[PDB]
Amino acid sequence: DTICIGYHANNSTDTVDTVLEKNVTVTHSVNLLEDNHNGKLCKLNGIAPLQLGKCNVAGWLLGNPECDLLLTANSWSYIIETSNSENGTCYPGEFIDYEELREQLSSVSSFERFEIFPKASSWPNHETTKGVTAACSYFGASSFYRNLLWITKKGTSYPKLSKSYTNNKGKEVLVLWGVHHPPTTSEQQTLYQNTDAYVSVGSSKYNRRFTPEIAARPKVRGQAGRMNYYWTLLDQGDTITFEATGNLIAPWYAFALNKGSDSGIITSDAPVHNCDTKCQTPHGAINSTLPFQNVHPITIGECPKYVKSTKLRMATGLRNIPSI
Amino acid sequence: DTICIGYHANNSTDTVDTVLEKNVTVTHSVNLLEDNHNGKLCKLNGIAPLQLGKCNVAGWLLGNPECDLLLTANSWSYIIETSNSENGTCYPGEFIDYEELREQLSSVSSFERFEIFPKASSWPNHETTKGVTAACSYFGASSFYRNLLWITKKGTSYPKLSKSYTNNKGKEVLVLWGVHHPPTTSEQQTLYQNTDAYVSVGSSKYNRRFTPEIAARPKVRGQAGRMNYYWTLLDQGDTITFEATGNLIAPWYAFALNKGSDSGIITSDAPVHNCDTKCQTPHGAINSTLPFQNVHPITIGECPKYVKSTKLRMATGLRNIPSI
Amino acid sequence: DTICIGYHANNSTDTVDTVLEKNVTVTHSVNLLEDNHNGKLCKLNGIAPLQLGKCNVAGWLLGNPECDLLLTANSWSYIIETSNSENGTCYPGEFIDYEELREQLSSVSSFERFEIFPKASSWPNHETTKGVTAACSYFGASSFYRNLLWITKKGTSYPKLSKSYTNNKGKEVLVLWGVHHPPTTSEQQTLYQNTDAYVSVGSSKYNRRFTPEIAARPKVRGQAGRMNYYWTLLDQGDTITFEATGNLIAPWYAFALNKGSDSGIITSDAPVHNCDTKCQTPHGAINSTLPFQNVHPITIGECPKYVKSTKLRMATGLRNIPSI
Amino acid sequence: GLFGAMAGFIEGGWTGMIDGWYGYHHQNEQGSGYAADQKSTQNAIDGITNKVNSIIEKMNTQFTAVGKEFNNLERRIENLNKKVDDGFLDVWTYNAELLVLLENERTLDFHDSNVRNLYEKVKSQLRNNAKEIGNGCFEFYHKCDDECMESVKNGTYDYP
Amino acid sequence: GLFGAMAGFIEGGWTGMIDGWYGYHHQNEQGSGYAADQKSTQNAIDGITNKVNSIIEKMNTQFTAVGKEFNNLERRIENLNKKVDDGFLDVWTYNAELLVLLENERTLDFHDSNVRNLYEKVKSQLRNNAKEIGNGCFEFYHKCDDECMESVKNGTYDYP
Amino acid sequence: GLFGAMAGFIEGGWTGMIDGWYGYHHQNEQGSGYAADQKSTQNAIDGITNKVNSIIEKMNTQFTAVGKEFNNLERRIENLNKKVDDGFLDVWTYNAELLVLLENERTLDFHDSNVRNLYEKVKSQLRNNAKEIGNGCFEFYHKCDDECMESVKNGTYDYP
C-alpha cells in the first residue's frame, strides 16, 4: 500500500518564457498580447466613421466637385481617408491651419450644412456666375468648389462689398473662405478691378486682414494663381463680418456643428462594416481586453498599449512533464 | 512541557491586496498614496504666490483700472487666478503670445514697475490726455490701462513720433505696448490723422512693424475697434526704439525683473495662507513624501506622481489572524 | 567520515543592494549602468560628423567669410558645434525657421553646393559688385556671405528683376535667400531706388511675399539695417521663381541634398576621431550594451535609457562570506 | 524549481490525474487511482485567476488618438511627438516583457511550493507509519484500505 | 502561504504575543507565556523598514509645473501635451498598482518564511527530544524548566 | 536568506571550493576536499546567465536625438519637451533602480534555495545512515570511503 502526491500533466504544447528559462512547456497558459484584427474599419463606440474615399478632408469641406457624395455627411466618430484621397483643393493654394482643422473636426456629434451667404441676391452688382475654373472640372465642364463662391466683377466695376452673418444656430459654426492671389497685376484688374484690393474678416474673436500677394510663381494643375483657404469656428451669438474690394472667395455654405471630444483620421483601404469596437486601427478593429497589442502604433479609442513584442504568454498552469 | 513557535496578531483591520488575494487583513501596513490636502494655497518653497483675484494676468500686466491693488506686486513663486479672473483687456483685442507670456512670468525673483516713458513731457505736440475709453471704466468714469498710454492727436495734426529706451536696469525689462485698429478709416483719421499710419518697434532682437488693420467687425464690450497687445523682454544693455505716425498705444510703465526658473499659474478659489509646501495643487498643498498622489493631475513643485489609484496600501506586518 | 554541503566564497568586494539589505558583499556581480565614455566625438554608424568649429549652422549655410573651410562639407551623420560657434549671420537679422532648418539638416546622405544663380550675367543692369559690408569682414577687407549675393543698384536706376530655377538635380534643393530692411527710407532709395520696393518668392509650395520693413532700430555689430534670412526645400521638378524691385539678397549658391532620417546637433569641445559608435553624447561616445546610462541626458543614436542613478549593480553570484 | 518538488524530487507529472493540478495516486490491495486534492487545487485556481485579472484589470487606458499630423515646418514638434510615442512604446515593451518573464517564474514557483506543501502535509500525518521513497511516494508500514487512503487525503489520518 | 507556516500548519496568530512578530509560547510545570524571538523580529523590522524606504526613496522628482495653456489654434500640441500627461499617468498607475500587489505578496511570503525558519530552527535543536504536533508545537519527552525553555529560545539547547 | 541555508544554518562560505557555486566537502579516513556539485552549479549559471541577458536583451531602443532647440517664443513647447525628458527620465530611474533591488533579492534567494535543495538532496539519500549536525554537515554512522563519498555526490548512495 502506497500513496504518492504528484501534479497534473497533459498534451499541451504552449510554451512561456521565464527569467531563468526559455520555452518552458506548460499545461495551461494565457495570452496577454493582442495580434489579431477583423481587418475592418468599424463603428467606434456605436458611431460609424465618415468615409471620404477619393476625396480628402480639404476636398470634402471646401466642396470639391468630386465630393458631391459627402454633401450629406452626418454623425461620424472618426474620419477615414484612403490611398485615393487625392481630391482636395482642386485650385492651388495653402489651406491655413489645415492640420489643426483636420484634428478639430475629428469627431462631430451633429453636423449641418447650410447656406450662410446664398449665391442668389447676396452679391448683387457683382458677378457671381463667372467664378468657375477648369482646374475644378465637373464632368468635363469647368466648375468650382460647392461651398465657396468665386465673386468676379460686374461689367467693368467691382464695388466694395460687405456681408455679415450672426450665428444663431445654437452651436459653433464652421465658416470657410478663401483669398485669391493672381500671378500678376494684369489679372488682378481684369477680375477685381481695384489693383490695390483687400479682404477683411471680423469676428469678436478674429481680425486678420488680407491683400492680394500677386507674384510670379509656377503653375499647379493649370493655374499660376493661388487661393489660400481660411476657416474659423464662429461661436454662438457672435457675428462674423466680411467686406472686400476684391480677391474674396466668399463663403457660400457653412456648417453648424456640435463637437464632443476629439478622435482622429484613420487612413486605410480596409473595408468598412457595421461592426463596433472600442479600439480602432488602420488594419482593423482590435479587442480592448488584453493589456498589450502589437497590431499598430497608431490607434483611436481606449486601446491596449502598443508594444514591439511578438509573444507575451503568461503561465497559468504548471510545468508540463508527461510521459509514462 | 511544550514550546510552540508562532506569530503576532492584533486588532488591526487594515487590509492590503496581493497578486493572489484581495483584502487580506494585515497587522501593520503603510500607505504609499497621498489623498489629503490642507485645502489652502500655500507658499512654494518659502515664497508666497501672487493673487490676482478679480483680475487675470492680462489685466494685471496691462494695468486694468480694476487691478490697482496689484500695482505693488513683488516676489511670488507661482501665480493664482480665480473663478473671478475676468478683469483683463477691458478694451477688445488680441494679446499676442499671451500664453507664452503667462508661462514665462510664472516665477519671478524681483519685479519692479517703473515709468519707462512718462506721460508728462515724452509725447509733447501729441495728445496724451484724451486716451480714455468707457470700455475701461474706473468708478463710473471713463479710464484706461495704467501701464499703457493712449496717444491721441493734438489739434488737427499728428506728427511722426520716435522714443527709445535703453535697459540699464541690470536685468531683463518687460516692455508692453499696443497697436490700435479702428473699425473704419473715418475714426483712423479723427484720432491719428494720417490715414496710412504705421507703428514700428526695433530692438537688437525685434523688428516686427505694424499698420492699422481697419476693418468692419462686431463690437465687444462697447468698442468696434480693436487693440492688439504686444510684449518683449528687453535684454540688459539693449535699446528698444518706438516710432509711429499713429495707432500706437505707447508703453507708459514697464517692469524690470529677474526670472529664476519657471512655475505656473494655479487657478483655484481656495484660501491663501502662510503655510509652506514643496508641492502645490488647485485643491491645496500636498505632502511630498509618498511616491504617489491622486489629489490632482495639475500640480506645481516637486510632487508625487499622479495616479488614478484610490488605494495603494503596502503590507509591513503579517497576515492578521486573531481569535482565541 | 563526514560530508558537508556548502557554497562558494572568494575575495570579491563587489556589493549590491537588495530590497531588504544595503551593501551586501557578493561573489560575482554585473554592472547594468554605463558611466564611461571615450571622451571623443566619434563617427555615428560609420559616418563621421560635420565640424563647424568657429562657425555655427547659420554661418556655414549662409556663407560667412569665416566658414570658407566648410564650403566642401559632405556626408556627415550629425552636426558638431563648439563653445566657439559664434561666426554666423555676420549681418544682423532674423533667421526665419532657423531651429527648424538646423533640425532638418541634422543628417544628410549627399550634399552638393552649386551655383543656382551665378553672379556673372544673371543680374545684368543691376549692381552685383557693391554688395559688400564691413560687418562681414574677410581679413580686414569688407566682404559678405559667399552663398548669397547682395544686389545693389546700377547707376541711378534699379529695374524690376525676375529669375527662376527649376530643380532638375534629382533630389531636394535647399534654396537660401534674404530680404534687407534699411534703418530708414533714405537708405532704401540710395540702394534700391524704389522707396516702395518688394520681393516675392514663388514655388508650387511657397508664396510668402515681402516688403522692406524700414524702421528705426539699434545697431548690431555695426549696421542699423537688418537682413532676415529665409530658406526652402525645393522638391524635384518644382520651379522656384524670384522677382523683386529691391531689397533682395538673392541666392547665389544653393545645395542639392539627400536627407535620410534625422539626427541632431551635438555641441561639445571634445576632440573628434575616427572611432565609431551607435550612441554619441556631448562628453563622448557611449557603449550601447547595458540597458541604462548616466553619462548625459542629451544623446544621439540607439542609446541606453538615461537615469539619475550612480549605481545599478546586479548580483550574479551569492552572498560572499569567507573567513576560515 | 525553487521549492525542489516539480521536476525535482517528483520529476514527472501525472497525465492520469485529470481533475486537478496537485493530487494523489494511491495503490492498495483494493485498487488504485488518481485523485486531485480539491482544496489546494481550487485555491491555486482562485489565486492564479485573480493574478491574471490584476495584470489585466490594472491596465487603465483613456480614449486617445495617437496620430498627429504636422506640416513640413513642424519637424521639431513632430519629432517630439515621435519621442513620446517611441518613448512610451519602449517603456511598455520592456515592462510588459519583464512583467511576464518575472510573473511566469513566480507562477511556476507557486505551483512547486503548492506541491511541496501538499507532500509535506501528508509526510506530516504519516510520520513513522510509512517510509519515504524520495519520489513523492510514501509506503505505509501498515495496510491502508480506501477509508484509510481517504483519511490521509481529507487530512484526518489516524495515530501515527 | 508560500512557505506553509502562516495560516498553514500554524493556522493562527497569537494575540497574546505583544513584543514581536515571530516568537514562542511555552508551557512547563513552572508557568507559561509568550516571548517574541528578538533576533528574527528585529531583522524582519530592519528589512521591511528598509524595503519601504526604497520604494519611497527611489522616487526621484524634479520641480515641474504640469499645466500648459494652449489657444484655440494649438489643439494638436495641446492634445500632444494631453498624451504625455495621460501617458505618464498610465505608466505610474499600472506600475504603482502592480508594484504594491507584488511587493505585498512578497512581504507576506517573507514573514511566512521567517516563521518556518524559526520553527525549523527549534525543530533542529530538539530532534528526538520532543514530538512534533503538526501545529507549530513541540512536546518535550523530558522536563524542560525555564532555564531549559530559555536555552531553546537563545538557541543553546543541550544534547538532543 | 529566504530558504534558511545561506548565512543561515550554513553560516559561512567555502573559500576552498573553487570550481563551483554549491558543493561538497568530505572528510574520510582516506583524505578530504572540496568538490562543486557540477549539475546544480551549471544550471544556476545557465539561469543567472539567461536572467542577465533578459534584463539587457529586452531593452529596445530606436535611433533618437533627444535634444530639441526652441526659440525664446516657444517656452511652452520647450517646457513640454522638458516634461517628456524629465518624465521618461523618472520612469527609467525608479524602474531600473527597483528592477535591480528586486532581482537582486531574487538572485540571492535563488542561490539559497539551491543550497537548501542540495542539502536536502543528500539529507534524503543518507537518511538514518548519518546524523545531521545542524551546519550543513552529515556524519555517517558507517565508514564512507571515496567511492562511497562519490556515490552520494553523483546521487547514487546505497541502502539507507
Ligand SMILES: CC(=O)N[C@H]1[C@H]([C@H](O)[C@H](O)CO)O[C@@](OC[C@H]2O[C@@H](O)[C@H](O)[C@@H](O)[C@H]2O)(C(=O)O)C[C@@H]1O
Ligand atoms: C476668373 C475666371 O473666370 N476664371 C478663369 C480662370 C482665371 O482666370 C484664373 O483662375 C485666375 O487665376 O482662368 C481659366 O483659364 C485658365 C487660363 O488662363 C490664362 O490666363 C493662362 O495663360 C492659361 O494658361 C490658362 O491657365 C481657368 O480655367 O482657370 C478660365 C476661368 O474662366
Ligand SMILES: CC(=O)N[C@H]1[C@H]([C@H](O)[C@H](O)CO)O[C@@](OC[C@H]2O[C@@H](O)[C@H](O)[C@@H](O)[C@H]2O)(C(=O)O)C[C@@H]1O
Ligand atoms: C480716442 C478717444 O478719445 N476714445 C474714445 C473712444 C474711441 O473713439 C474708440 O475707442 C475708438 O475705437 O470712443 C468712446 O466712445 C464710444 C462710442 O464711439 C462711437 O464711435 C460709437 O458709434 C458708439 O457706439 C460708442 O462706442 C469710448 O468710450 O470708447 C469715447 C472715447 O473718448
Ligand SMILES: CC(=O)N[C@H]1[C@H]([C@H](O)[C@H](O)CO)O[C@@](OC[C@H]2O[C@@H](O)[C@H](O)[C@@H](O)[C@H]2O)(C(=O)O)C[C@@H]1O
Ligand atoms: C550697400 C553697400 O554698399 N553696403 C554698405 C553698407 C550699407 O549701407 C548698409 O549695410 C545698409 O544697411 O554700409 C557700410 O557702411 C556702414 C556705415 O553706414 C552708415 O550709413 C552709418 O551711418 C555708419 O555708422 C556705418 O555703419 C557697411 O560696411 O555696412 C558700407 C557698405 O559698403
Ligand SMILES: *[C@H]1O[C@H](CO)[C@@H](O[C@H]2O[C@H](CO)[C@@H](O)[C@H](O)[C@H]2NC(C)=O)[C@H](O)[C@H]1NC(C)=O
Ligand atoms: C482629384 O484627384 C484625381 C486623382 O488624382 C485628379 O485626377 C488626376 O488623376 C487622373 C487619373 O485618372 C487624371 O485626370 C490626372 O492625372 C489628374 N487630374 C488631372 C490633371 O486631370 C482629379 O483631377 C481631382 N479632381 C478634381 C478636378 O479636383
Ligand SMILES: *[C@H]1O[C@H](CO)[C@@H](O[C@H]2O[C@H](CO)[C@@H](O)[C@H](O)[C@H]2NC(C)=O)[C@H](O)[C@H]1NC(C)=O
Ligand atoms: C472686469 O470684470 C467684470 C466682471 O465680469 C466686468 O463686469 C462685468 O460684470 C459686471 C457684473 O457685476 C457687469 O458690470 C457687466 O456684466 C460686466 N461689465 C460691464 C459690461 O459692465 C468689468 O466691467 C471688468 N472691468 C473692467 C472695466 O475692465
Ligand SMILES: *[C@H]1O[C@H](CO)[C@@H](O[C@H]2O[C@H](CO)[C@@H](O)[C@H](O)[C@H]2NC(C)=O)[C@H](O)[C@H]1NC(C)=O
Ligand atoms: C565671428 O565670431 C567672432 C568671434 O566672436 C567675431 O569676432 C568677435 O570677437 C573677436 C575677438 O577676437 C573681435 O573681433 C570682436 O570682439 C568680435 N567681432 C568684431 C566686432 O570684430 C567675428 O567678427 C565673427 N566673424 C564675422 C566677421 O562674421
Ligand SMILES: *[C@@H]1O[C@H](CO)[C@@H](O)[C@H](O)[C@H]1NC(C)=O
Ligand atoms: C488534448 O487533450 C484534450 C483533453 O483535455 C483533447 O480534447 C484534445 O483533443 C487533445 N489534443 C491533442 C493536443 O492531442
Ligand SMILES: *[C@@H]1O[C@H](CO)[C@@H](O)[C@H](O)[C@H]1NC(C)=O
Ligand atoms: C522554443 O525554443 C526556441 C527558443 O529557445 C524557439 O525559437 C522555438 O520556437 C521553441 N521550440 C519549441 C517547439 O519548443
Ligand SMILES: *[C@@H]1O[C@H](CO)[C@@H](O)[C@H](O)[C@H]1NC(C)=O
Ligand atoms: C487596538 O489595540 C491597541 C493596542 O496595541 C489599543 O491601543 C487600541 O485602543 C485598540 N483599538 C482597537 C482597534 O480596538
Ligand SMILES: *[C@@H]1O[C@H](CO)[C@@H](O)[C@H](O)[C@H]1NC(C)=O
Ligand atoms: C474587502 O473586500 C472587498 C474587496 O473584495 C472590498 O470592497 C471591501 O471594502 C473590503 N471589506 C472588508 C471590510 O474587508
Ligand SMILES: *[C@@H]1O[C@H](CO)[C@@H](O)[C@H](O)[C@H]1NC(C)=O
Ligand atoms: C582574488 O582572487 C583571484 C583568484 O580568483 C586572484 O586572481 C586575484 O589576484 C585576487 N585579488 C584579490 C582581490 O586579492
Ligand SMILES: *[C@@H]1O[C@H](CO)[C@@H](O)[C@H](O)[C@H]1NC(C)=O
Ligand atoms: C556600503 O555601506 C554604505 C551604504 O550603507 C556605502 O556608503 C559604502 O560605500 C559601502 N561600504 C562598504 C565598503 O561596504
